[PDB]
Design a binder for this molecule. Structure first.
Ligand code: HEM
Length: 418
């Protein structure tokens, strides 16, 4: 138990594939421990994690997007060449300004406004499945799930048709760079893309200011800046395109990939949702609890504070193993039961809790639900193919990189006889 704390290393297959099992020892008997390989304190229980999320002044989100790689002089030089001035934009932003900015920018995330995006999501998903449904073997990640949430994010922002086509090359992987230990080479490749995207978005922001009464979050926020000029700076608005894409893209990809893996691995449940699609919203919620995209999330203390009887110093790094909380028998009855009927499944912590709780969570849920319904209606007869599941190593987000499935196209429901 002393040994497991000293040896704690999340940069390995077992933490990525099943973090809740990997730390079950700690959830059961060691609710806080220091991990000297990380210089992080690690918490694993549902109520400890809710307590930390509940106080954003004591427990700052300043380290949420902090890379574990050693810092890069070449990275800084590339970003300064492009005039990069990305702000800490909501997810890792401190009080008091975070809640003031969330108050003025949150309206377009309301369920009533996200409802306008539903036809576009349905069309993207139908068009993606059309491109592979007649083949009989496909990787659901590379052949649909990767791209759909990137395009959805650009629609939520209000990016115009020509600009979305020019943005295809910016749909890169950010998870290892922000939450893991990228090589010097990967760090520099991401920096170059980020700087180029900063330049591209400066130009999009001028155009959006010319059509400020048009649709989407960016134009909403430009109109809010006119009402609250001392709350919304120009560089914060410039930062909002990247912030939303990072927030909305791989999160949703990982959630959907995991949900499909779990539903196909639990064949009786796949059969149930193929028979009764009204079960899909609740099923997607239990997928988030049982096999969610968030392994871990982070905070840094701003004052000495007692957590589980241990007084942490100022500036202490905390890893909250959200997947462990989501498997915690002290909150979830029979947590190893994958139960799509679970009434409290939405009490999972993949969207956080409290002041920074995910603003886009209902759009993420809608995308998951539409992708599951399209595949259960048009490919009920598919099955997971034999394959190895590989996870990129990082502290926060987990999903297999590929998800191969196979089926008989002649038995597709849209071709099958009555
Ligand atoms: C399944 C998909 C998603 C997951 C798992 C997810 C997860 C998260 C998490 C863990 C946080 C931090 C919560 C906290 O500290 O309490 C967060 C914040 C946020 N997410 Fe999401 N997210 C998802 C989808 C999206 C989408 C689709 C958007 C945009 C439309 C989005 C926008 C945001 C924003 C703007 C924040 C910052 C809120 C704040 O700090 O006040 N997310 N998300």
């Amino acid at each position: 138990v002393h040994r497991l704390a000293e040896d704690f290393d999340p940069f390995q297959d077992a933490y990525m594939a099943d973090p809740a099992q990997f730390v079950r020892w700690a959830r059961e008997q060691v609710p806080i421990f220091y991990a000297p390989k990380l210089n992080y304190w690690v918490v694993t229980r549902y109520d400890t994690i809710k307590q930390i999320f509940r106080d954003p002044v004591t427990f700052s989100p300043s380290n949420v997007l902090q890379s574990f790689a050693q810092p890069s002089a070449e990275v800084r030089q590339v970003l300064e060449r492009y005039g990069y001035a990305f702000n800490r934009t909501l997810v890792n932003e401190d009080e008091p300004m975070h809640l003031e900015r969330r108050r003025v920018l949150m309206e377009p995330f309301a369920s009533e406004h996200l409802a306008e995006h539903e036809p576009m999501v349905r069309e993207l998903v139908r068009r993606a499945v059309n491109r592979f449904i007649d083949t009989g073997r496909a990787d659901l990640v590379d052949q649909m799930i990767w791209e759909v949430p990137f395009t959805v994010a650009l629609h939520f922002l209000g990016v115009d048709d020509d600009d979305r086509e020019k943005m295809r090359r910016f749909a890169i992987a950010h998870t290892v760079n922000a939450f893991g230990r990228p090589s010097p080479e990967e760090q520099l490749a991401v920096a170059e893309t980020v700087g180029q995207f900063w330049q591209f978005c400066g130009e999009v922001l001028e155009k959006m200011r010319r059509t400020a009464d048009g649709p989407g979050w960016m134009r909403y926020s430009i109109r809010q800046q006119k009402l609250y000029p001392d709350v919304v700076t120009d560089s914060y608005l410039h930062s909002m395109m990247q912030a939303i894409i990072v927030a909305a893209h791989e999160t949703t990809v990982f959630a959907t990939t995991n949900a499909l893996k779990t539903l196909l691995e639990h064949e009786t449940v796949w059969r149930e949702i193929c028979a009764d699609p009204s079960l899909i919203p609740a099923a997607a919620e239990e997928c988030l609890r049982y096999n969610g995209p968030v392994a871990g999330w982070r905070r840094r203390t701003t004052r000495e504070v007692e957590v589980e009887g241990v007084r942490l110093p100022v500036g202490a790094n905390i890893l909250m193993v959200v997947a462990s909380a989501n498997h915690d028998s002290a909150h979830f009855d029979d947590p190893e039961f994958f139960d799509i009927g679970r009434s409290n499944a939405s009490e999972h912590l993949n969207f956080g809790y409290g002041a920074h709780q995910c603003l886009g969570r209902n759009l993420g849920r809608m995308e998951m639900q539409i992708m599951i319904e399209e595949l259960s209606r048009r490919l009920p007869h598919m099955r997971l193919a034999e394959q190895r599941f590989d996870y990129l190593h990082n502290v926060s987000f987990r999903a297999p990189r590929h998800l191969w499935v196979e089926w008989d196209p002649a038995q597709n429901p849209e071709r099958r006889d009555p």
